[PDB]
Amino acid sequence: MVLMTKPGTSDFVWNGIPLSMELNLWNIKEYSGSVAMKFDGEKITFDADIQNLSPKEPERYVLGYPEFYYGYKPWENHTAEGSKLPVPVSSMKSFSVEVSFDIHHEPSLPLNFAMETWLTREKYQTEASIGDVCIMVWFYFNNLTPGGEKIEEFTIPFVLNGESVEGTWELWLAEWGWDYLAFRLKDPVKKGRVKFDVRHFLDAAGKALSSSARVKDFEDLYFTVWEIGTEFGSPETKSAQFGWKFENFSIDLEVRE
């Protein structure tokens, strides 16, 4: 059992999987009130009731991303012990991720439930820059739109609550300090169970970036981590009340030459 009540990172092991939990309030300059994240051996929960919020950089828009992850998160130069990641995108035959989730929030709060990875040129960078990519997969959103511009839609399968469905995913692309690609499910789900293969998203991002002038040799990039969390806030938001619970977590990364 692990508990955190202030920003920071803690490692844990869940169902034999080495993971990292991060009570991530990366773009908040100051806050008052309470935040708590806990892992009890069977579930990870997060609860926030914070006020007196101000951002560090208004330009970034969101305020934080409480989350847990498998692998090496570049920004925090951090990995738990025993992860197979990072590996070259080309080394990933399949990467199945499964998790149950229940997200709740005050109605007007901009928020999402999104997963993400950082594809980088070198294996252990401490930042992302031109030539690198951030790929996100949004299963839910409230009062929040991905950054960049919507450039297309893809039909990508996934198992929703036990049933194979064909989801419709909007691809938003932003060319910032690195490339940002966000795939947003058009039928957002606030609570449920999902199982999917990250390889499908990597294949779709690879095609969308095939003609890029900033990103080259996509398959040679290092898939560093797989983050699961909830971004929240906006430059104007002065308070936030929300929380979540994730359970039934398993992942399977299949490595090939």
Ligand X SMILES: OC[C@H]1O[C@@H](O[C@H]2[C@H](O)[C@@H](O)[C@@H](O)O[C@@H]2CO)[C@H](O)[C@@H](O)[C@@H]1O
| Site residues (vs ligand BGC, CB under 6 A) | 60-62, 144-147, 182, 231
Of 40 and 149, CB closest to ligand X? 149
Whole-Å CA distances, 30 to 52, 132, 196, 234: 7, 30, 37, 14
Of 88 and 154, CB closest to ligand BGC? 154
Please select the residue that binds ligand X; options are 19, 23, 24, 184, rule is CB under 6 A.
24
> Which residues, in sequence order, are CB contacts of 59 under 8 Å at separation 6+?
235
140 touching ligand X, by CB under 6 A? no
231 touching ligand X, by CB under 6 A? yes
> Taking Cα atoms as reference points, which of 1, 4, 48 lies closest to residue 23?
4
Please select the residue that binds ligand X; options are 12, 65, 226, 246, rule is CB under 6 A.
65
Q: How buried is 194 (Cβ within 10 angstroms: 0-12 exposed, 13-18 middle, 19+ buried)?
A: buried
> Which residues, in sequence order, are CB contacts of 163 under 8 Å at separation 6+?
none
137 touching ligand X, by CB under 6 A? no
Of 160 and 183, CB closest to ligand X? 183
Which does residue 10 touch among ligand X, ligand BGC, none (CB within 5 to 8 A, set by kind)? none
CA gap 148, 176 in Å, rounded:
9
Longest dimension (CA), the chain: 51
Cβ atoms 158, 165 nearer than 8 A: yes
Q: How many CB atoms lie within 10 A of CB 130?
A: 13
154 touching ligand X, by CB under 6 A? no
Of 67 and 197, CB closest to ligand X? 67
Of 2 and 75, CB closest to ligand BGC? 75
Looking up tokens 């095609």, which residue turns up? 207
Which does residue 146 touch among ligand BGC, ligand X, none (CB within 5 to 8 A, set by kind)? ligand BGC
Of 31 and 160, CB closest to ligand X? 31
- State the residue number with the nearest CB to ligand X: 65
- The residues of the shown chain that bind ligand X, judged by CB under 6 A, are 24, 26, 62, 65, 75-76, 116, 134, 136, 180, 231
